[PDB]
DNA sequence: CGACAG
DNA sequence: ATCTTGTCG
């Protein structure tokens, strides 16, 4: 499954950050009507200090059926540094999208989209290389302030970056936390939320795509 | 000084 | 992310 190469990955911080400013300055935060008929999930485990193996589920929606499952282990050498993920997970996760045949409506991934210090977290940024509406799903804060919603299995906040909305906190489950949804590209908050909201089945945290992507990535780390 | 996706 | 088993609701 091809895509572009905007850039190189091995650049030095400092660079990378001059990359991503650049960056941002593509993302067409459009809307997306209508219900998708391909959705997949991206996600990265690390069987060794240096070595990652990353993994792609395509799902069928509505009936969230997995129709594909592809993979990549390698090495790992550019650091986790908050606000530069997409060089760590990035290059893997497109060596596996090489090997994917299936064409995704909509790809999510386990972390930021818009919701970043620069606009343009690891859902944007792939989102820009591999043309296909992305959004971002993560677990914890980086950036943008909120008002944490009622611990009530459906409530929800906007993210905010000052009085521009940016993404939003939603309780997909009661007792637990919730989750950190955000526009990658070619996708915008009003539709982000609202198809999310659409891949999370009752009970369960985070949503299928992830949550698949995920299981996959801890399992193939031994059996 | 604090904060800081995975 | 990863180190780790049982245990509490
Ligand atoms: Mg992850």
């Not at 959705?39 to 193996?53: I, R």
């Not at 540094?81 to 090489?98: D, N, S, V």
Request: charged share 30%; with cysteine.
């Amino acid at each position: 499954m091809d895509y572009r190469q905007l850039h190189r990955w091995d650049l030095p911080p400092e660079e990378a950050i001059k990359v991503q400013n650049e960056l941002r300055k593509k993302i067409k935060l459009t809307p997306y009507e209508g219900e998708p008929e391909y959705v997949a999930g991206v996600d990265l485990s690390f069987p060794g200090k240096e070595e990652g193996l990353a993994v792609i589920v395509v799902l069928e929606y509505p009936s969230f059926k997995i129709l594909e499952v592809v993979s990549e282990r390698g090495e790992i050498t550019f650091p986790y540094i908050p606000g530069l993920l997409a060089f760590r997970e990035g290059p893997l996760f497109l060596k596996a999208w090489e090997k994917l045949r299936t064409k995704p409506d909509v790809v999510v991934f386990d972390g930021q989209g818009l919701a970043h210090p620069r606009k343009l977290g690891i859902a944007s940024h792939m989102g820009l290389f591999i043309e296909i509406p992305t959004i971002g799903v993560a677990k914890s804060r980086l950036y943008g302030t909120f008002k944490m919603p009622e611990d009530k299995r459906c409530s929800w906040s906007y993210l905010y970056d000052g009085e521009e909305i940016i993404g939003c906190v939603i309780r997909t489950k009661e007792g637990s936390a919730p989750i950190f949804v955000s526009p990658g590209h070619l996708m915008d908050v009003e539709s982000s939320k609202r198809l999310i909201k659409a891949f999370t089945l009752p009970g369960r945290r985070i949503p299928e795509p992830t949550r698949l992507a995920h299981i996959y990535t801890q399992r193939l780390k031994k059996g």
